Amino acid sequence: GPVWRKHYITYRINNYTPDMNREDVDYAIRKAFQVWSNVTPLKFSKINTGMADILVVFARGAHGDDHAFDGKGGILAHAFGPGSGIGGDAHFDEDEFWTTHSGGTNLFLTAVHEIGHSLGLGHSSDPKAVMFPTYKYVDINTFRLSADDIRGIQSLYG
Numbered sequence: 422g423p424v425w426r427k428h429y430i431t432y433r434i435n436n437y438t439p440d441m442n443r444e445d446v447d448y449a450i451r452k453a454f455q456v457w458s459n460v461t462p463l464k465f466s467k468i469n470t471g472m473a474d475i476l477v478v479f480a481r482g483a484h485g486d487d488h489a490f491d492g493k494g495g496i497l498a499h500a501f502g503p504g505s506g507i508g509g510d511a512h513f514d515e516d517e518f519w520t521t522h523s524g525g526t527n528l529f530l531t532a533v534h535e536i537g538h539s540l541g542l543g544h545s546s547d548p549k550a551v552m553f554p555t556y557k558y559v560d561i562n563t564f565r566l567s568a569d570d571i572r573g574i575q576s577l578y579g
């Protein structure tokens with residue numbers, strides 16, 4: 422499927438969950454992009470205005486895309502593969518409780534997965550992969566991509 426055909430990729434945070442400190446949302450998203458730039462030639466920059474490649478959105482229920490959210494639990498987030506318009510965009514269910522830690526749903530870990538999709542990755546069948554489509558908290562301070570994630574992303578870039 423689709424990949425970004427350029428190395429400089431922009432993102433923008435459309436709005437902020439009230440669940441977290443603003444600075445902690447910025448840092449979680451930044452760190453999640455870094456996971457992928459670590460293993461590809463991509464460079465990611467946060468822009469404050471105008472059209473970004475990847476728009477990061479918090480929203481609940483129906484939110485304008487035909488992929489309605491389902492309240493607390495279940496679907497936590499979804500994202501669109503590379504492309505124009507909404508392509509690349511990553512949406513996070515405001516009905517979850519987003520955190521920097523093991524409580525609620527960890528924003529950083531979820532965003533690593535969502536950004537994987539924004540870059541063109543699909544789901545992995547390997548429970549060890551961040552792209553495995555089941556949320557399970559792991560210690561974020563020492564998080565690492567699985568072999569499967571790295572082979573997946575390096576099949577698309579670099």
Ligand SMILES: COc1ccc(S(=O)(=O)N(CC(=O)N=O)C[C@H](O)CO)cc1
Pocket residue numbers: 495496497498499500530531532534535538551553554555556557
């Ligand atoms: C660690 O990163 C994630 C793990 C799971 C999910 S999820 O919302 O739970 N997911 C939807 C999805 O894959 N969106 O990209 C899976 C099923 O549809 C519902 O369980 C999101 C991010």
Ligand SMILES: [Ca+2]
Pocket residue numbers: 490491492493494495496497514516517
């Ligand atoms: Ca949900």
Ligand SMILES: [Ca+2]
Pocket residue numbers: 473474475476504505506507508509510
């Ligand atoms: Ca977009």
Ligand SMILES: [Ca+2]
Pocket residue numbers: 438439440514515516517518519
């Ligand atoms: Ca919330």
Ligand SMILES: [Zn+2]
Pocket residue numbers: 484486488499512
């Ligand atoms: Zn959406």
Ligand SMILES: [Zn+2]
Pocket residue numbers: 534535538544554
């Ligand atoms: Zn997914």
